């Protein structure tokens, strides 16, 4: 099996909420290593616990390898090892490149497939609880070499037991990225005693990610430049109050350009976005419904 002792760190590649991400080499293979200090044990353990959930593995969820410790002789580092994806985040990918219609659908479908897998409860002996992400954003999705996505940063996730109707942790309010917070999270009206609330807040965030991808879809050399959702309405590093005034009070959502109505795939994406963006979480599409719509679209396009 893969163990920390056999891994050599090569390059710093990112900073998580807590813990730094490194590219490393293990038995002639590149891996990603997230490193936490001893004082970040609760965060490291929670992430190891989520990643070790029964039946979690899916092509659109970051592939977990091992939770380990490494003692350098002075202090102990807590490690989480996972698959390495050279392209980095969907945010990085979208800033660097434009995508074709086929490219856009692959990114959106793979994101929705990963989310539907997290959200779905799988019954049976090797059963999987339903899981809500709570920090979905383009900076937390990684892009693979084949042009498909995988959801990363599962540290803030919440897991549900449907039989006893319980959540595995006592969740704190407004934990994620402010820019991507659902309206009910921004105005703290979210009912955190009902698990469906967390899945519905993830859907809103996915609609924002879909908008980021669609902007980069190039047809006849025509596309928009890269932007974060609400780039036109809030400052860089927005506060909860700044987001709340825009999303809850003024009821604004990222702008849907005119050029998206001319393309069938762009019309389907724009419709999904609007149906992720209702203020009431119960009115939103489910990740399963979105996966089904994008699967039919990919089939008709011959992707």
UniProtKB/Swiss-Prot annotation:
Localization per record: Cell membrane; Cell junction, Tight junction; Cell surface; Membrane raft
| Enzyme Commission code | 2.7.11.30
Q: What is the effect of changing residue 2 to D?
A: Loss of response to TGF-beta
Where expressed (tissues)? Found in all tissues examined, most abundant in placenta and least abundant in brain and heart. Expressed in a variety of cancer cell lines.
Which reaction equations make up its catalytic activity? Answer: L-threonyl-[receptor-protein] + ATP = O-phospho-L-threonyl-[receptor-protein] + ADP + H(+); L-seryl-[receptor-protein] + ATP = O-phospho-L-seryl-[receptor-protein] + ADP + H(+)
Which cofactors go with this protein?
Mg(2+); Mn(2+)
Which positions are annotated as binding ATP? 13-21, 34
Which residues of this protein are catalytic?
Answer: 135 (proton acceptor)
Q: Site of the Glycyl lysine isopeptide (Lys-Gly) (interchain with G-Cter in SUMO) crosslink?
A: 193
Major localization listed first in the record, in broad terms: membrane
How is the enzymatic or functional activity of this protein modulated? Answer: Kept in an inactive conformation by FKBP1A preventing receptor activation in absence of ligand. CD109 is another inhibitor of the receptor.
GO biological process entries? activin receptor signaling pathway; angiogenesis involved in coronary vascular morphogenesis; anterior/posterior pattern specification; apoptotic process; artery morphogenesis; blastocyst development; cardiac epithelial to mesenchymal transition; cell motility
Name the keywords, alphabetized.
Aortic aneurysm, Apoptosis, ATP-binding, Cell junction, Cell membrane, Craniosynostosis, Differentiation, Disease variant, Disulfide bond, Glycoprotein, Growth regulation, Isopeptide bond, Kinase, Magnesium, Manganese, Membrane, Metal-binding, Nucleotide-binding, Phosphoprotein, Receptor, Serine/threonine-protein kinase, Signal, Tight junction, Transferase, Transmembrane, Transmembrane helix, Ubl conjugation
Ranges for domain Protein kinase come to 7-297
- Give an example GO cellular component term for this record: membrane
GO MF terms listed in the record are: activin binding; activin receptor activity, type I; ATP binding; I-SMAD binding; metal ion binding; protein kinase activity; protein serine/threonine kinase activity; SMAD binding
Query: Could you tell me the superkingdom of the organism this chain comes from?
Result: Eukaryota
Q: How is it modified after translation?
A: Phosphorylated at basal levels in the absence of ligand. Activated upon phosphorylation by TGFBR2, mainly in the GS domain. Phosphorylation in the GS domain abrogates FKBP1A-binding. N-Glycosylated.
Topology relative to the membrane, per the entry?
A: Single-pass type I membrane protein
Query: Which stretches face the Cytoplasmic side?
Result: 2-303
Cross-link Glycyl lysine isopeptide (Lys-Gly) (interchain with G-Cter in ubiquitin): located at? 70
Q: What does the subunit comment say?
A: Homodimer; in the endoplasmic reticulum but also at the cell membrane. Heterohexamer; TGFB1, TGFB2 and TGFB3 homodimeric ligands assemble a functional receptor composed of two TGFBR1 and TGFBR2 heterodimers to form a ligand-receptor heterohexamer. The respective affinity of TGBRB1 and TGFBR2 for the ligands may modulate the kinetics of assembly of the receptor and may explain the different biological activities of TGFB1, TGFB2 and TGFB3.
Give the linked disease. Answer: Loeys-Dietz syndrome 1: An aortic aneurysm syndrome with widespread systemic involvement, characterized by arterial tortuosity and aneurysms, hypertelorism, and bifid uvula or cleft palate. Physical findings include prominent joint laxity, easy bruising, wide and atrophic scars, velvety and translucent skin with easily visible veins, spontaneous rupture of the spleen or bowel, and catastrophic complications of pregnancy, including rupture of the gravid uterus and the arteries, either during pregnancy or in the immediate postpartum period.
Query: Can you tell me which family this protein belongs to?
Result: Belongs to the protein kinase superfamily. TKL Ser/Thr protein kinase family. TGFB receptor subfamily.
Q: What is the role of the protein in this entry?
A: Transmembrane serine/threonine kinase forming with the TGF-beta type II serine/threonine kinase receptor, TGFBR2, the non-promiscuous receptor for the TGF-beta cytokines TGFB1, TGFB2 and TGFB3. Transduces the TGFB1, TGFB2 and TGFB3 signal from the cell surface to the cytoplasm and is thus regulating a plethora of physiological and pathological processes including cell cycle arrest in epithelial and hematopoietic cells, control of mesenchymal cell proliferation and differentiation, wound healing, extracellular matrix production, immunosuppression and carcinogenesis.
Name of the molecule in the record: TGF-beta receptor type-1
Q: Report which part of the complete sequence is shown.
A: 200 to 501 of 503
């Amino acid at each position: 099996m893969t163990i920390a002792r056999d891994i050599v760190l090569q390059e710093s590649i990112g900073k998580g909420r807590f813990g730094e991400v490194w590219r490393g080499k293990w038995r002639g293979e590149e891996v990603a290593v997230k490193i936490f200090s001893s004082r970040e044990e609760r965060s490291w353990f929670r992430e190891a616990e989520i990643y070790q959930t029964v039946m979690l593995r899916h092509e659109n969820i970051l592939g977990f390898i091992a939770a380990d410790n490494k003692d350098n002789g002075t202090w102990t580092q807590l490690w989480l090892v996972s698959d390495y994806h050279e392209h980095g985040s969907l945010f990085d990918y979208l800033n660097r490149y434009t995508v074709t219609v086929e490219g856009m659908i692959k990114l959106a479908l793979s994101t929705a497939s990963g989310l539907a897998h997290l959200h779905m409860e799988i019954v049976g002996t090797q059963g999987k609880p339903a899981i809500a992400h709570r920090d979905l954003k383009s900076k937390n999705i990684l892009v693979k070499k084949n042009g498909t996505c995988c959801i990363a940063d599962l540290g803030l996730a919440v897991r549900h037991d449907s039989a006893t109707d319980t959540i595995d942790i006592a969740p704190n309010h407004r934990v994620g990225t402010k820019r991507y917070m659902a309206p009910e999270v921004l105005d703290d009206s979210i009912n955190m005693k009902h698990f469906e609330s967390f899945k519905r807040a993830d859907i809103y965030a996915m609609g924002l990610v879909f908008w980021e991808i669609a902007r980069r879809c190039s047809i006849g050399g025509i596309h928009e430049d890269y932007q974060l959702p609400y780039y036109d309405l809030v400052p860089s590093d927005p506060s909860v109050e700044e987001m709340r005034k825009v999303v809850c009070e003024q009821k604004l959502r990222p702008n849907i350009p005119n050029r998206w109505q001319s393309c069938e795939a762009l019309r389907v994406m724009a419709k999904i976005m609007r149906e992720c963006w209702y203020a009431n979480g119960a009115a939103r599409l489910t990740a399963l419904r979105i996966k089904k719509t994008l699967s039919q679209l990919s089939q008709q396009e011959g992707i």
